Design a protein around this nucleic acid. Structure first.
Lengths: 172, 170, 68, 156
RNA sequence: GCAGUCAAGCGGCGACAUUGCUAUCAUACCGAAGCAGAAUUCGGUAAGCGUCUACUGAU
RNA sequence: AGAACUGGCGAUGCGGGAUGAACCGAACGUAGAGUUAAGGUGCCGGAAUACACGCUCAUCAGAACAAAAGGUGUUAGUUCAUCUAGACAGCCGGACGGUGGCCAUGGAAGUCGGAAUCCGCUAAGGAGUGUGUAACAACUCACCGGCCGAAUGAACUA
């Protein structure tokens, strides 16, 4: 319960500590990617939390609650908008497949492999699998598809960080 | 039938101390004798003055200002059972205080097997606003335009036979 | 015969086509089964076993709670 | 607590029809608009709460079966003794058992080895048939047998 | 039994665990065992069969 | 066993506990008229299948002892926390870096063994709660993000 107060105080303190306030539309990303984004610079700070808590915290300032609902990613940054947006639109990482988020991967009708035999591989869902006295033995995917792709280590999800709204810390 | 009587306590005045402590309290009972007995019993435990040294001055009945208004009475009760005594709180929806306490006693006998001997009335007050009724089964009746049927009605007849076999529609 | 005969068979053919589901369902029924048996001299033994298990679990939880 | 109220088809006495499937059911219904059916139980207890919920689930299952149907897919495998199945449904030659077994829309499935598919409008009937077929000595030593693969719908 | 970390209550006691020697035998629908198979024991169920009053023949 | 005290039987009817010495009322001329006590009011049994509250389905409920516990049985309350900053459950996702945290083993990368659990960061995380690995890996448990719309989670008491 007290964890909400920590985010409340941190946001209310860091609001004026940075030149610009930005909201990022990201809600499903691997933690290492988020940590890399956070450590990519020191002049900006990544803000996240509950959407409703942010709405209550974000009135503190004029028109502050308008774009707060579009957070729950929120970013405090002092650098110019041009650099931040250029990095966001250029930065991209091939993350793990997510539900209903296009390659021609197909499971061979024979022995199964860790990567599904796509590469020339290390032999090892409701599919008609069977055990061949020790071995396991086509199928295609193009939510179960995302799980199947993850089982084979496929990272077709080319997620890119994006910015939705612009707010001025001194002029809204 | 139950009734409400107000009693006061001014245990005999020692020299130079007339009208001591004006021990006023309210008692729920059927007749005046039972009300006085319960008042004496309560005094014998709340403090150390005995009945022999005490004296009843006046007993007056207290009716209800609006005996035709439905109220959600809040009831605080202290009672005892096979285990040590423990306080209890309940809410009853009734028109009058006397009816509310009667239903309280009946419910205590039903679920808690208690009786008049083991039941002590702490205080009774009316709930002035909605959403203050903690008990859900009482707040249920406070919904807007509550309407419900009464399926499977029962009926009685003087005659011991009937040629119709009537249905319980209602 | 062999040092891992049953282990070899399990590793080569796994288990029944629904062994996992059957075991999960049987474990799920344990809560209902325990309650049903508690109300059905064997009663003394069942009550003693249940009380001993409850006491052991409570003691283990309380002793380890000191870590926080 | 002491509850007071809780909540092409037709509503009448406990004999119900859905369009076809029919079933026999202490509750009441209302044909408000023929699209949503109200379920109401008055002065009920703990038992009534459970009884009311199961009626809605059964009605939903019947509606889904009528509109989509259910198909309990099944499959079987053998190691040494081939399992002989003929379609009345019969099971023979399993484990060398001379005691031929018999079971009361049932047909084989193409392009899937040793697969048998059961389908029907009523969910209960199909499920009971699948359970009966599955029902018919170290437990782990024999992988062979007949088991349900997936309880998919007819209109997959 | 001796002393005790022993402790829900509780007027200095206290069920609970741990530390020292001194209504089936087979007849089984059912599950477990490290039950590859036979065999096996265990919890399973059933007492079915195994192992001067009264009439036994009567008017 | 010894023994201080008060009541009935002893010598004591009759009503009732269907059944009786240890119980309750009541102690007594034969009678006519009405009201009670114990004890009763569905029948054997003369008397209301009376009124109101809920309680319980016992696989033999209900009409002096094993009584400490069990029930995810039921009917109602006390205490501690969460709670519209969005109750629990149900789902999707995060669930990370030094790291293969220190020691031998053929191997032990968190889950065959011995002991600390350092610590960056975040909305969030144990050098890990389990399934699982020959040795990896994957799911995941407490811990967090989104949908949902309000009262809920835990121990006791009658």
């Amino acid at each position: 319960r007290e964890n909400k107060e920590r985010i409340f105080d941190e946001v209310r303190e860091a609001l004026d500590t940075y030149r610009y306030v930005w909201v990022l539309h990201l809600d499903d990303v691997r933690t290492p990617v988020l940590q890399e984004i956070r450590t990519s610079w020191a002049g900006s700070k990544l803000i996240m939390g509950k959407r409703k808590v942010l709405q209550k915290a974000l009135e503190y300032k004029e028109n502050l609650y308008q774009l707060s609902k579009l957070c729950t990613g929120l970013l405090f940054t002092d650098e110019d908008v041009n650099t931040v947006k250029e990095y966001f639109k250029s930065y991209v990482r091939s993350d793990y497949s997510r539900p209903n988020t296009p390659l021609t991967f197909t499971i061979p009708e024979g022995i199964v492999y860790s990567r599904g035999g796509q590469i020339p591989d290390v032999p090892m869902f409701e599919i008609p699998t069977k055990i061949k006295a020790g071995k396991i033995t086509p199928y295609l995917v193009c939510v179960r598809q995302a799980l199947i792709l993850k089982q084979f280590g496929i990272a077709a999800s080319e997620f890119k960080v994006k910015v939705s709204a612009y707010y001025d810390n001194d002029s809204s | 039938h139950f009734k409400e009587y107000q009693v006061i306590g001014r245990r005999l005045p020692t020299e130079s101390v007339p009208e001591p402590k004006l021990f006023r309290m309210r008692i729920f009972a059927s007749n005046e004798v039972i009300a006085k007995s319960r008042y004496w019993y309560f005094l014998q435990k709340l403090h150390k003055v005995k009945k022999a040294s005490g004296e009843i001055v006046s007993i007056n009945q207290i009716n209800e200002a609006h005996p035709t208004k439905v109220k959600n009475f809040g009831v605080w009760v202290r009672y005892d059972s096979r285990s040590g005594t423990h306080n209890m709180y309940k809410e009853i929806r009734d028109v009058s205080r006397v009816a509310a306490v009667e239903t309280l006693y009946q419910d205590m006998a039903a679920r808690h097997r208690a009786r008049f001997r083991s039941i002590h009335i702490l205080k009774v007050a009316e709930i002035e606003k909605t959403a203050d009724v903690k008990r859900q089964y009482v707040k249920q009746f406070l919904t807007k335009d509550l309407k419900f049927p009464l399926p499977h009605r029962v009926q009685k007849s003087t005659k011991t036979f009937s040629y119709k076999r009537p249905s319980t529609f209602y | 015969p062999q040092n891992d005969y049953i282990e070899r068979h399990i590793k080569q053919h796994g288990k029944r086509l629904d062994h996992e589901e059957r075991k999960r369902k049987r474990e799920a029924r344990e809560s209902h089964k325990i309650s049903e048996r508690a109300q059905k001299w064997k009663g003394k033994q069942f009550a003693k076993k249940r009380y001993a298990e409850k006491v052991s679990m409570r003691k283990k939880i309380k002793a380890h709670e000191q870590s926080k | 607590m002491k509850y007071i109220q809780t909540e092409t088809v037709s509503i009448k006495s406990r004999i119900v029809k859905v369009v076809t499937l029919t079933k026999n059911l202490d509750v009441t219904f209302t044909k408000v608009n023929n699209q949503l059916i109200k379920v109401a139980v008055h002065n009920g207890g703990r038992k009534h709460v459970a009884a009311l919920r199961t009626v809605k689930s059964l009605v939903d299952n019947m509606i889904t079966g009528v509109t989509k149907g259910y198909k309990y897919k099944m499959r079987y495998v053998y190691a040494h003794f081939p399992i002989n199945v003929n379609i009345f449904i019969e099971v023979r030659n399993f484990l060398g058992d001379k005691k031929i077994r018999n079971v009361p829309t049932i047909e084989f499935s193409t392009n899937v080895k040793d697969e048998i598919v059961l389908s029907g409008n009523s969910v209960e009937d199909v499920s009971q048939n699948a359970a009966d077929l599955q029902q018919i000595k170290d437990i782990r030593k024999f992988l062979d047998g007949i088991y349900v693969s997936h309880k998919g719908f007819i209109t997959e």
